[PDB]
Design a protein around this motif. Structure first.
Motif, PDB file in Angstrom:
ATOM      1  N   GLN A   1       0.815  -1.193   0.000  1.00  0.00           N
ATOM      2  CA  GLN A   1       0.000   0.000   0.000  1.00  0.00           C
ATOM      3  C   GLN A   1       0.852   1.247   0.000  1.00  0.00           C
ATOM      4  O   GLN A   1       1.973   1.265   0.499  1.00  0.00           O
ATOM      5  CB  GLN A   1      -0.917   0.021   1.217  1.00  0.00           C
ATOM      6  CG  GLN A   1      -2.033  -1.018   1.153  1.00  0.00           C
ATOM      7  CD  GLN A   1      -2.479  -1.363   2.551  1.00  0.00           C
ATOM      8  OE1 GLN A   1      -3.170  -0.607   3.205  1.00  0.00           O
ATOM      9  NE2 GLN A   1      -2.042  -2.485   3.073  1.00  0.00           N
ATOM     10  N   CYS A   2       0.281   2.314  -0.528  1.00  0.00           N
ATOM     11  CA  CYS A   2       0.862   3.635  -0.448  1.00  0.00           C
ATOM     12  C   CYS A   2       0.964   4.114   0.992  1.00  0.00           C
ATOM     13  O   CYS A   2       0.052   3.915   1.783  1.00  0.00           O
ATOM     14  CB  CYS A   2       0.013   4.585  -1.273  1.00  0.00           C
ATOM     15  SG  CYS A   2       0.319   4.270  -3.015  1.00  0.00           S
ATOM     16  N   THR A   3       2.057   4.784   1.313  1.00  0.00           N
ATOM     17  CA  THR A   3       2.401   5.290   2.643  1.00  0.00           C
ATOM     18  C   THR A   3       2.453   6.811   2.711  1.00  0.00           C
ATOM     19  O   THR A   3       2.581   7.373   3.792  1.00  0.00           O
ATOM     20  CB  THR A   3       3.750   4.718   3.064  1.00  0.00           C
ATOM     21  OG1 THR A   3       4.733   5.132   2.150  1.00  0.00           O
ATOM     22  CG2 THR A   3       3.769   3.198   3.070  1.00  0.00           C
TER      23      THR A   3
ATOM     24  N   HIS B   1      -3.796   3.126  -0.264  1.00  0.00           N
ATOM     25  CA  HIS B   1      -4.192   2.765  -1.619  1.00  0.00           C
ATOM     26  C   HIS B   1      -3.429   1.549  -2.121  1.00  0.00           C
ATOM     27  O   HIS B   1      -2.237   1.438  -1.877  1.00  0.00           O
ATOM     28  CB  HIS B   1      -3.936   3.958  -2.516  1.00  0.00           C
ATOM     29  CG  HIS B   1      -4.529   3.839  -3.878  1.00  0.00           C
ATOM     30  ND1 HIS B   1      -3.964   4.300  -5.030  1.00  0.00           N
ATOM     31  CD2 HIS B   1      -5.819   3.513  -4.165  1.00  0.00           C
ATOM     32  CE1 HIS B   1      -4.891   4.243  -5.993  1.00  0.00           C
ATOM     33  NE2 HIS B   1      -6.037   3.746  -5.518  1.00  0.00           N
ATOM     34  N   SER B   2      -4.080   0.647  -2.845  1.00  0.00           N
ATOM     35  CA  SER B   2      -3.517  -0.641  -3.235  1.00  0.00           C
ATOM     36  C   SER B   2      -3.830  -1.001  -4.674  1.00  0.00           C
ATOM     37  O   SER B   2      -4.709  -0.412  -5.290  1.00  0.00           O
ATOM     38  CB  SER B   2      -4.045  -1.735  -2.323  1.00  0.00           C
ATOM     39  OG  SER B   2      -5.379  -2.028  -2.666  1.00  0.00           O
TER      40      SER B   2
ATOM     41  N   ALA C   1      -8.202   2.575   1.744  1.00  0.00           N
ATOM     42  CA  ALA C   1      -7.626   3.773   1.167  1.00  0.00           C
ATOM     43  C   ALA C   1      -8.068   4.994   1.977  1.00  0.00           C
ATOM     44  O   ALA C   1      -9.098   5.584   1.708  1.00  0.00           O
ATOM     45  CB  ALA C   1      -8.047   3.832  -0.299  1.00  0.00           C
ATOM     46  N   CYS C   2      -7.314   5.352   3.006  1.00  0.00           N
ATOM     47  CA  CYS C   2      -7.664   6.359   4.007  1.00  0.00           C
ATOM     48  C   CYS C   2      -6.898   7.683   3.899  1.00  0.00           C
ATOM     49  O   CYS C   2      -7.128   8.570   4.714  1.00  0.00           O
ATOM     50  CB  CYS C   2      -7.461   5.716   5.370  1.00  0.00           C
ATOM     51  SG  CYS C   2      -5.746   5.179   5.519  1.00  0.00           S
ATOM     52  N   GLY C   3      -5.988   7.842   2.938  1.00  0.00           N
ATOM     53  CA  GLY C   3      -5.214   9.073   2.729  1.00  0.00           C
ATOM     54  C   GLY C   3      -6.038  10.311   2.391  1.00  0.00           C
ATOM     55  O   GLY C   3      -7.223  10.226   2.100  1.00  0.00           O
TER      56      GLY C   3
END
Ligand SMILES: CCCCCCCCCC(=O)OC[C@H](COP(=O)([O-])OCCN)OC(=O)CCCCCCCCC
Ligand SMILES: CCCCCCCCCC(=O)OC[C@H](COP(=O)([O-])OCCN)OC(=O)CCCCCCCCC
Ligand SMILES: NCCOB(c1ccccc1)c1ccccc1
Ligand SMILES: NCCOB(c1ccccc1)c1ccccc1
Lengths: 623, 623
Positions: free
Chosen positions: B100-102, B109-110, B138-140
């Motif tokens: 996932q995006c950091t 996001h995946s 996806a919580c960003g």
């Protein structure tokens, strides 16, 4: 008056078996080549050529070949090929095909222009194959852009074809073996077929679709035909590129299309918008800033704010990229906008204090320092406004309805400096000027209402009336002087209104709701004086009620959505001005966007990234 | 600024034959699996994994698999299966599929989110079959609901599918063998796919149809898939159920649909409206009161009156059942409404008497008793208003345009108590406060105009202007002070306006139609003083005429039918307040409707019976 281009009714003017002009014009207008059969022999015997004044219309130079091409039957006239053959057979040093009108109205017009306008592809081929010059310019007053009877299309044969929507003609003129046209070729104003298409635009749904389809088609055609030439980088004699001319002229439909332009496949290099990523209702695009960003002189931003005079101007600044670009320039600048407002408030506070408690004609030293600060502040503002009007000089007087605060800031500075001059001269008239300067300085405070949306959109909805206030005052002051002389003249005789100015100010009070009807029992004609005052009041209430109604009709017949658009234009003008910095200290203008390779022709461009969310448009794309 | 999610133009940032990131991202974006053939050997030799920072975009953590899924050709990319196989063959302790995006913008996001958004069912299967976790969030900041560039869909893969209108994806995620999704699963805000569908709603005809069809479909799907779970009884982290969130958010189209929902056949238990009998144009239905009736805390009625800030609020209270429910609560309460009005009239009459015939600074005993009654009445009202503001504390300041009488009742009570305090202190300022309290107390009498339709719909049509009265006064008071200082300063010199307050009040009179133009022949600058007064009058009449026109445009651009709707909302707020009883005596709140078995899952519910007559709708049903 110039003659008709062609007429069935009025003969063209004058100003071996014989073959005069009227015999010749009769055969070619009928289109009967067998009757032409004496002409070669007659010309040969006399040593005459079909180009000669005797065979033209005298006032225009219109030739027999132009007469032939004005008279086409099903797109043909069987005389043209024989007539051209007779010119070749004659041994004319000039070529009949390239003969042109010499009249000030039709100057430079030729048989090829007429053929294209008559939409005869056959005649276009037939003329080009026989040596027609495809670059002759129809530059006469009929062909220039102005009011009344004219048709501007550029001036070149290729540009007429494009503006007449003839794709077959355009392709033949470009592709033919005999004399290929040039997309780079230019009219007497420097306008190239792309500029001509911008000039013929009208912002109507139909005209826009034609113009857009012809512009894109030619740009694709140029990519194939002349790959090394940037057609959109060619400038008018006024140094405008087709995009910049679309901005100056206010052609918002073609302006939007060029600015936003996107293509996939082999034509991708012709794009100015490049789509970058999409996710649900979110679209991110790069936009090409070339000639749009205020970094360079004479950009579309400076042209829209300063050089355009179209009513469309506010609608143009709310298009992407310009809307996000101006927002980023505002977000960077806004600290300097409120700093300028803070300095103006400090100056106006010091002015208010210095005006208010001032002696009649330590505390004295503080008053002198206060006078010095307002003198210096007035000089500083005077210089800043003089520099603004000098920087604008080529396009002053474009829009008083956008400019009026720059005049009123100049006026307040002039009266401030002049009042301080008179105060140093020790003359009593200084106090009136200082007080009148204080009043303007407080009214000028309204300029900064644009710096906040809450006050910026309210002020724009309102600030409707100041144009109508004059038209009212001028008409009304004529009624005022007539009744004022009438009252003074009628009041001289005893059994009030002693002077024209006195009587005018009384009649003014009656207009603004401060009137005073009474029998003036001191004076002889008191009944007739009262009749005049009644008539004046009633006519004034009619004139006021007319003004109110006229104005209210323009309120029902109005659209509220312009308010936000006009506020954005005010911020744009503010941004573009203050990006220069001050008259005493120039600003380093940094370029917007970033330099990216958008493909290969290496196609590297200053791109600005724009992110748009559009739920409505995205949902239309769903199953 | 965060990087683009994908770009053709800008490379991702940094912050045995070699196989670096740029080699890898090039092969997977082209989609050519034969070029991947060195990668396993290189990774094995180095002891490196595709999850490692060296293979991500540095600023986001975006992996090669996310790059592969961002680049789909006809919904496919032949690299994905080989690349996943290489991760398995590598012996990575983490799984590439679940990477996932950091970054703070794209956090969580995946590859699965991207596959669903790209609408590739093949990739969704291919990822799930290879162990994709269907519950990654996806919580960003791109995925949270706010202003600017974002897309809220909930945060879960199932919720994206639903909001993107992909029924094939939704069914596969729910039904698949490998890792079935959960309709109960929840995002970082507690929102479940049903809440997410309420949040993406916009009250547009199209968005509403999508949302309604996806909501009903999922609710039917849940009835089959998880029969023991009440999907609409799951609460957000703000303790709202999907119906309650539709009320809070003001999503009237989805709110109406849920509230009115009716189904026949196997799905009947999912209904909230049950049709009972019809006869000609008469339809009788039972409606489910669950979470709607004010009996329980935090109902849709309390949420619409108190917690909602949508302009739609008045439109929501006129829907069934709420319209008949509120009418029955009003019909029960209306005796207490007129009793409260009677007590306020008695208090205000005693106040009027006690103010009016009072001595200068038996009958004395009656005056003292009158002071005591208004002191006690003022204390009683003060306490009642303090209790109201304390009970509202979590949602004070929602709507001043509904609340302003509660402030003015507080203000009148404060000034009443304070005036009686000053009267006990024997200080002359008590009489001004008692009189100012009497004035507010008479103006506060307008609150009760809502208790009658004749006066309730007239008052609502009017009570338009009080917001505009400020904007006028603020702008105008700035003109006033500038001209006031100017007059005072100009009037100091002899051959009126002695003080800033004096001059301001004269200039105020000239604004309200009480002006007095004359030559002030006492003072030196009389001509310039008259110029200032003329300028002031004209600018004031321009500003008034601007205000009148602005306001009148918002009168032509208006709909009269809102008046009845807004009056119903005022009665609703009154009903919901007074159903509590008084600060000194709580009310027993009895439940509305009756407990009925509407079917078997025993499905017993509090139902309210509603009878509707609709000649128009019934006649459309006839042959
Ligand atoms: C905070 C303390 C301020 C003390 C008072 C200083 C004199 C201010 C005079 C004045 O009113 O300046 C306003 C001006 C902004 O003008 P504008 O761009 O809004 O005007 C046009 C808008 N329509 O402001 C500026 O240009 C910036 C302020 C001056 C900078 C220093 C000058 C040094 C010169 C050597
Ligand atoms: C008929 C004889 C009446 C004699 C006067 C009594 C004092 C009345 C003070 C007053 O004005 O009360 C008004 C109040 C209604 O308030 P509201 O809900 O409309 O206010 C908000 C509306 N926006 O009324 C009530 O709350 C009910 C009346 C008092 C009940 C007895 C109190 C006993 C306390 C121990
Ligand atoms: N103090 C700033 C208030 O802004 B507003 C404002 C006030 C004066 C002039 C222009 C705008 C405003 C606009 C509409 C409704 C309510 C207020
Ligand atoms: N005395 C009650 C009269 O009600 B009406 C009323 C009176 C004052 C304020 C509001 C409403 C009324 C409304 C419309 C037409 C005629 C009368």
């Amino acid at each position: 008056e110039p003659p008709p281009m062609e007429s069935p009714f009025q003969r063209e003017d004058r100003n071996p078996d014989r073959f005069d002009r009227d015999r010749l014009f009769s055969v070619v207008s009928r289109g009967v080549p067998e009757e032409l059969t004496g002409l070669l022999e007659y010309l040969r015997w006399n040593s005459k050529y079909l180009t000669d004044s005797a065979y033209t219309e005298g006032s225009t130079g219109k030739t027999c070949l132009m007469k032939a091409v004005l008279n086409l039957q099903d797109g043909v006239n069987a005389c043209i090929m024989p007539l051209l053959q007779i010119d070749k057979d004659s041994g004319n040093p000039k070529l009949l095909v390239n003969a042109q009108c010499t009249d000030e109205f039709y100057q430079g017009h030729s048989a090829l222009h007429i053929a294209i306008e008559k939409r005869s592809l056959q005649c276009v081929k037939l003329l080009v194959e026989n040596g027609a010059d495809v670059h002759l310019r129809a530059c006469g007053r009929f062909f220039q852009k102005h009011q009344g009877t004219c048709f501007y299309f550029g001036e070149l044969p290729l540009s007429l074809a494009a503006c007449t929507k003839q794709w077959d003609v355009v392709t033949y003129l470009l592709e033919n073996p005999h004399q290929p046209a040039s997309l780079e070729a230019t009219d007497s104003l420097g306008n190239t077929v792309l500029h001509a298409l911008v000039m013929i635009a009208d912002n109507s749904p139909e005209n826009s679709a034609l113009v857009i389809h012809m512009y894109d088609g030619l740009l694709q055609m140029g990519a194939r035909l002349c790959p090394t030439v940037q057609l959109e980088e060619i400038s008018n004699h006024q140094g405008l590129t087709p995009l910049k001319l679309a901005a100056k002229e206010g052609k918002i439909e073609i302006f939007r299309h060029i600015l936003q332009r996107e293509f996939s496949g082999p034509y991708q290099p012709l794009s100015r918008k490049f789509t970058e990523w999409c996710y649900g209702p979110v679209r991110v695009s790069l936009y090409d800033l070339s000639s749009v960003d205020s970094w360079e002189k004479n950009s579309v931003l400076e042209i829209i704010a300063f050089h355009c005079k179209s009513p469309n101007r506010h609608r143009m600044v709310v298009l992407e990229p310009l809307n996000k670009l101006l927002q980023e320039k505002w977000d960077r600048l806004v600290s300097r906008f409120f700093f300028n407002f803070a300095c103006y408030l400090v100056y106006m506070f010091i002015f208010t204090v210095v005006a208010y408690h001032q002696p009649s004609l330590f505390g004295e030293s503080m008053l002198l320092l206060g006078h010095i600060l307002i003198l210096l502040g007035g000089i500083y503002l005077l210089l800043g406004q003089l520099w603004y009007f000098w920087r604008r000089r080529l396009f002053i007087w474009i829009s008083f309805m956008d400019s009026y605060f720059e005049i009123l800031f100049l006026l307040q500075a002039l009266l401030t400096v002049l009042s301080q001059v008179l105060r140093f001269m020790e003359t009593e008239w200084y106090l009136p000027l200082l007080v009148l300067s204080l009043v303007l300085g407080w009214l000028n405070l309204l300029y900064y209402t644009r710096g906040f949306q809450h006050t910026g959109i309210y002020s724009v909805m309102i600030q409707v009336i100041l144009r109508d206030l004059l038209r009212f005052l001028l008409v009304y002051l004529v009624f005022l002087f007539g009744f004022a002389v009438a009252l003074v003249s009628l009041s001289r005789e005893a059994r009030p209104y002693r002077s024209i100015l006195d009587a005018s100010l009384e009649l003014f009070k009656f207009t603004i709701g401060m009137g005073e009807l009474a029998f003036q029992e001191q004076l002889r004609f008191r009944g007739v004086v009262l009749l005049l005052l009644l008539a004046y009041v009633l006519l004034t209430y009619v004139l006021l009620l007319n003004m109110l109604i006229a104005l209210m009709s323009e309120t029902v017949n109005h659209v509220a959505d312009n308010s936000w658009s006009i506020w954005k234009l005010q911020k744009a003008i503010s941004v573009l001005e203050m990006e220069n910095g001050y008259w005493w200290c120039r600003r380093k203008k940094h370029r917007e966007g970033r330099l990216l390779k958008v493909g290969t022709r290496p196609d590297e461009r200053w791109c600005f990234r724009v992110e748009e969310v559009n739920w409505a448009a995205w949902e239309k794309t769903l199953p």
